[PDB]
Design an enzyme around this catalytic site. Sequence first.
Site, PDB file in Angstrom:
ATOM      1  N   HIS A   1       0.846  -1.193   0.000  1.00  0.00           N
ATOM      2  CA  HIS A   1       0.000   0.000   0.000  1.00  0.00           C
ATOM      3  C   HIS A   1       0.890   1.254   0.000  1.00  0.00           C
ATOM      4  O   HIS A   1       1.856   1.330   0.769  1.00  0.00           O
ATOM      5  CB  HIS A   1      -0.912  -0.037   1.244  1.00  0.00           C
ATOM      6  CG  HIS A   1      -1.659   1.236   1.496  1.00  0.00           C
ATOM      7  ND1 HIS A   1      -1.376   2.062   2.561  1.00  0.00           N
ATOM      8  CD2 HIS A   1      -2.680   1.820   0.825  1.00  0.00           C
ATOM      9  CE1 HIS A   1      -2.186   3.104   2.537  1.00  0.00           C
ATOM     10  NE2 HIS A   1      -2.985   2.981   1.493  1.00  0.00           N
TER      11      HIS A   1
ATOM     12  N   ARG B   1       0.428   6.329  -6.473  1.00  0.00           N
ATOM     13  CA  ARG B   1      -0.455   7.498  -6.491  1.00  0.00           C
ATOM     14  C   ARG B   1       0.336   8.672  -7.055  1.00  0.00           C
ATOM     15  O   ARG B   1       1.254   9.161  -6.403  1.00  0.00           O
ATOM     16  CB  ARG B   1      -0.896   7.840  -5.064  1.00  0.00           C
ATOM     17  CG  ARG B   1      -1.367   6.657  -4.250  1.00  0.00           C
ATOM     18  CD  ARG B   1      -2.591   6.054  -4.870  1.00  0.00           C
ATOM     19  NE  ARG B   1      -3.153   4.975  -4.064  1.00  0.00           N
ATOM     20  CZ  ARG B   1      -3.747   5.144  -2.888  1.00  0.00           C
ATOM     21  NH1 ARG B   1      -3.853   6.357  -2.362  1.00  0.00           N
ATOM     22  NH2 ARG B   1      -4.283   4.101  -2.266  1.00  0.00           N
TER      23      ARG B   1
ATOM     24  N   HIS C   1       1.256  11.833  -1.746  1.00  0.00           N
ATOM     25  CA  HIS C   1       0.387  11.301  -0.700  1.00  0.00           C
ATOM     26  C   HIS C   1      -0.387  12.555  -0.320  1.00  0.00           C
ATOM     27  O   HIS C   1       0.087  13.363   0.479  1.00  0.00           O
ATOM     28  CB  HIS C   1       1.116  10.777   0.535  1.00  0.00           C
ATOM     29  CG  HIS C   1       0.181  10.516   1.677  1.00  0.00           C
ATOM     30  ND1 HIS C   1      -0.684   9.441   1.691  1.00  0.00           N
ATOM     31  CD2 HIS C   1      -0.150  11.275   2.749  1.00  0.00           C
ATOM     32  CE1 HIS C   1      -1.512   9.558   2.712  1.00  0.00           C
ATOM     33  NE2 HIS C   1      -1.210  10.661   3.371  1.00  0.00           N
TER      34      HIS C   1
ATOM     35  N   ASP D   1       0.734  -2.870   4.506  1.00  0.00           N
ATOM     36  CA  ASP D   1       1.612  -1.768   4.880  1.00  0.00           C
ATOM     37  C   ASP D   1       2.840  -2.421   5.499  1.00  0.00           C
ATOM     38  O   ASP D   1       2.804  -3.597   5.872  1.00  0.00           O
ATOM     39  CB  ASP D   1       0.973  -0.877   5.951  1.00  0.00           C
ATOM     40  CG  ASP D   1       0.212   0.303   5.376  1.00  0.00           C
ATOM     41  OD1 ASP D   1       0.205   0.502   4.140  1.00  0.00           O
ATOM     42  OD2 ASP D   1      -0.391   1.047   6.180  1.00  0.00           O
TER      43      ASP D   1
END
EC number: 4.6.1.13
Length: 296
Positions: free
Chosen positions: A32, A69, A82, A274
Amino acid sequence: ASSVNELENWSKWMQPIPDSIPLARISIPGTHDSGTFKLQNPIKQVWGMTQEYDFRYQMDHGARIFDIRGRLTDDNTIVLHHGPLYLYVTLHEFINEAKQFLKDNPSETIIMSLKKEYEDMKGAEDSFSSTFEKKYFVDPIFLKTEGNIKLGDARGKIVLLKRYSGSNEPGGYNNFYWPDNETFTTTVNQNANVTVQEKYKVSYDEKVKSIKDTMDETMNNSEDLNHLYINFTSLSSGGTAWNSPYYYASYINPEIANYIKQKNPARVGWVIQDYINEKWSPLLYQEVIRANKSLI
């Protein structure tokens, strides 16, 4: 491709699995927010950090799915973010790590998830999707076939999981609904169903049961090659220490690992976690890889 002790080689665990098996059926470990490993700032670590080691370390520990991301900049490139926080990592940087790993371990494949994390910078020339597909996706390393992609077609290449809406180029898994902060089930292409559990920002107890419930459904649907299962074990609440992603991961990872070890399931799904490391007692990623012994 005959011995189960070949799954113990974290760098080449996909080697023993048959070519004909769809990627959806294989139990695959993932990370993640993969690119937060460079955050060295205290206040930033408590809120945004979810990994402490680089991309290569993650890959050498069995991880094959990556959560990227990004954000379009003034320089017309895509960097990792983030929220409004620049991570000090670029998209080119990830692709080059992946390329070198696929060169050293050709039996493997990596699945890259791409999501637009923040609004484009003012001076950008094109859109987020266009810039990605014109300057990046065009590279031969990206698999350009769609449908229920199999391991044989994926070896040596990067497989895209689209979480952005502008796409015009065929390839990988297409963009689908995906409602925010919850578990759901929809359709991908013409031949596939998807069940996702991404309940970030929820109480600890609610989270643990959501993971287990989704995992129980996958075990019971082991032979459904047309169903894709994505299970996020990551939790994001309100940092401030003893409430950070690290605190949560130190309980959730050993907990879910043991849950798999006891059940002895035939299928576990795609588990994006994670803090992949060697600290916590039973290793989550290792237990996920071993759940593929039934495919051999």
